[PDB]
């Protein structure tokens, strides 16, 4: 049962090994401590363990061995959750894609103030005068050409320096998924149509008894192929020549030549073909003559689309962290800028919520982001939870719209009147 | 009925051929003894057999021939099982993958002490001070970067030498299978989606009587091809030339040349193509006009996954055996390190349980591991069984999790309203 770093600090009142009246500190959790020992322990500082052993701070190489000292047994006795307080989905007023996206990007309470605050906790640098932990006095929120948030340059002041830098938040290339029945596409319209091909046929059934269906099967297949090969060839030739020459016609210059040829080659390539292959088969239980018509065509298609509530959010932040100026531990301080991943949408290795959980459990997997735990030393990591919740929660609002694409193949089958036949 | 080496030692009290009052020792089982004669017999020592014959120890070449002597008839009269005492599956507290795996790797009673003890019986070297047959005083259990168990270097002492070596146990690359209904994947979410293609169509059925369905069949096929060829060519050319030259224009330098060419080549190659080929066919028993829409798309898919109990364990040990310093018999003592297979999961030739059984039966098949029987000489092989059971038994605990993968193809079929048609 892994112990979270939050409460892990020293219990001042406690004695430890001599009888704390708490649940014992053990070896299993003790080994798990190594990566954040600096947070908990002073260089020389010593801490105990229930099996009659002790831990030492960063000053020493120390293995887990015998000693006497206090520590937290208290926290392990009653662990606390660590969870996000509320997952609830946000409801924003509905509209069209332009406006809905804007409202989301515009929201001070729902987007900006919380995103900025989260940024503040996470390491982002500050700019100029301040009002609270988020968006400063001079700071402002305007739109980038891309639709992202941006501010004016003139004032400057990042980290209290005259440089031009400003924080920006990207709008995502939105992607959504919808579990419910709540959305729909309307009737199609063909802007333009060209007719590629037609095929017609019929079944003639004069006789009374034998009645059977007819099958027309088509295939329209077009394909492209691409390949490249590289060949290496080596030629070895040894030759000898004599000048005796044979009187009739040996040849004055008589040469014999042997050539050995070796060549090898490797290649790769591939092709893709698309086929439109319709099959029509009328059962036609009637004594008749039945025309059938099968059509292939190309067209421009457009559909109006009914409003859909859900949207997924992809966020990566700006590169301000390098300016950040906070105690790092995991990373060295470096000038060159690095964009930090915020992924809200579910990508397991990328997503922030998981990383938050992972930091609590402690897992040594591969990582490329600044960790969550250093906030505990710096800010305490309390009462922040709602702020994180603001960023993490799903947001939805109905956006009505269009469905359109490049011109596509389409097809059709028409059936005629089964004309009465007689013998 | 093969006799196990366990009880096979000499019966001190017995006379043997003269009338032991036990079931007879026979030739069939006697021949099976050769590979472990050294355990049972002294160099000169002699042992009997019921058909009036005798066996001799390693000092002699001895065939099975006449003589008089005692042996065990006693054990063969009443054989004992040799089995693992209990197969029962372990129950560990549930959780997420990070924590469940940890708890398993952390368990002193269930994992470490028994695994170490098993290692001790099997030939693994010891380190420094000891407390019992398993994990020594100085020895400790901490985590490797990989998640494996490791300990500190400073103290040293393997086999009582200052060298750095320490024992390590690998966490497996977990693999599991589940017979029961007990697990599930939740609703899918699409992180991102790109639409590859769309095809639309309809069946028009104005006339009252003829009603029949419509079939749209698609194929999207993409493929890659790779190949390499090597060609060898040999050229043999004999030429002759004369300088007579023909007055009009024979050519002053008149040459005739014959070239024989031989070439051959061999090649190998292959290609793979994947096709997405949907078929949609509405029966549509109605007089109507029915639109159909078929879609191909690409997307990122993610599913939350319900907890699953079972996990299979793959274990191979460290390379400590070379340091081991025990009586070998089968293998020569060598310095270079060799990792020894522990396979818990079922791989027939690899698995430990089978090898244990195989050692009891005696089978000369190909083998690449230290055998089980030498433990009998060294430790007696008693009361160990529960320890082996600790390692061998299946372990399970529900791990909830995610299901994710690289972006994949997906598709969809939509059907329209069958619009009433009239003649």
UniProtKB/Swiss-Prot annotation, chains A, B:
Disulfide bonds join 18-74, 158-163. Residues 322-331 are annotated as: Interaction with glycans from host GPI-anchor. Gene3D superfamilies: Aerolysin/Pertussis toxin (APT), N-terminal domain, Proaerolysin, chain A, domain 2, Proaerolysin, chain A, domain 3. It comes from Aeromonas hydrophila. Homodimer in solution; homoheptamer in the host membrane. After binding to GPI-anchored proteins in target membranes and proteolytic removal of the C-terminal propeptide, the protein assembles into a heptameric pre-pore complex. A further conformation change leads to insertion into the host membrane. Keywords: Disulfide bond, Host cell membrane, Host membrane, Membrane, Secreted, Signal, Toxin, Transmembrane, Transmembrane beta strand, Virulence. It is found in: Secreted; Host cell membrane. This is Aerolysin. It comes from the Bacteria. Changing residue 308 to A: No effect on heptamerization.
């Amino acid at each position: 049962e892994p112990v979270y770093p939050d409460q892990l600090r020293l219990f001042s009142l406690g004695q430890g090994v001599c009888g704390d009246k708490y649940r014992p500190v053990n070896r299993e959790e003790a080994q798990s401590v190594k990566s954040n020992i600096v947070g908990m322990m002073g260089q020389w500082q010593i801490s105990g363990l229930a099996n009659g052993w002790v831990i030492m701070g960063p000053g020493y190489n120390g293995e887990i061995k015998p000693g006497t000292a206090s520590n937290t047994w208290c926290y392990p006795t009653n662990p606390v959750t660590g969870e996000i307080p509320t997952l609830s989905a946000l409801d924003i007023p509905d509209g069209d894609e332009v406006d809905v996206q804007w409202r989301l990007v515009h929201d001070s309470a729902n987007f900006i103030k919380p995103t900025s605050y989260l940024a503040h906790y996470l390491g982002y640098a500050w700019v100029g005068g301040n009002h609270s932990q988020y968006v400063g006095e001079d700071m402002d929120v305007t739109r980038d050409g891309d639709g992202w948030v941006i501010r004016g340059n003139n004032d400057g002041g990042c980290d209290g320096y005259r440089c031009g830098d400003k924080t920006a938040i990207k709008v995502s290339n939105f992607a959504y998924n919808l579990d419910p029945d709540s959305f729909k596409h309307g009737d199609v319209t063909q802007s333009d149509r060209q007719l590629v091909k037609t095929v017609v046929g019929w079944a003639v059934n004069d006789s009374d008894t034998p009645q059977s269906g007819y099958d027309v099967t088509l295939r329209y297949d077009t394909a492209t192929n691409w390949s490249k090969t590289n060949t290496y060839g080596l030629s070895e030739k040894v030759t000898t020549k004599n000048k005796f020459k044979w009187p009739l016609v040996g040849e004055t210059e008589l040469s014999i030549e042997i050539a050995a040829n070796q060549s090898w080659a490797s290649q790769n390539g591939g092709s893709t073909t698309t086929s439109l292959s319709q099959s029509v088969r009328p059962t036609v239980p009637a004594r008749s003559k039945i025309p059938v018509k099968i059509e292939l065509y190309k067209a421009d298609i457009s559909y109006p689309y009914e409003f859909k509530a859900d949207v997924s959010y992809d966020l990566t932040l700006s590169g301000f962290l390098r300016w950040g100026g906070n105690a790092w531990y995991t990373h060295p301080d470096n000038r060159p800028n690095w964009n930090h991943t915020f992924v809200i949408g579910p990508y397991k290795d990328k997503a922030s919520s998981i990383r938050y959980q992972w930091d609590k459990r402690y897992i040594p997997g591969e990582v490329k982001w600044w960790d969550w735990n250093w906030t505990i030393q710096q800010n305490g990591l309390s009462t922040m939870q709602n702020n994180l919740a603001r960023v993490l929660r799903p947001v939805r609002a109905g956006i009505t719209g269009d469905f359109s694409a490049e011109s596509q193949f389409a097809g059709n089958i028409e059936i005629g009147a089964p004309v009465p036949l007689a013998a």
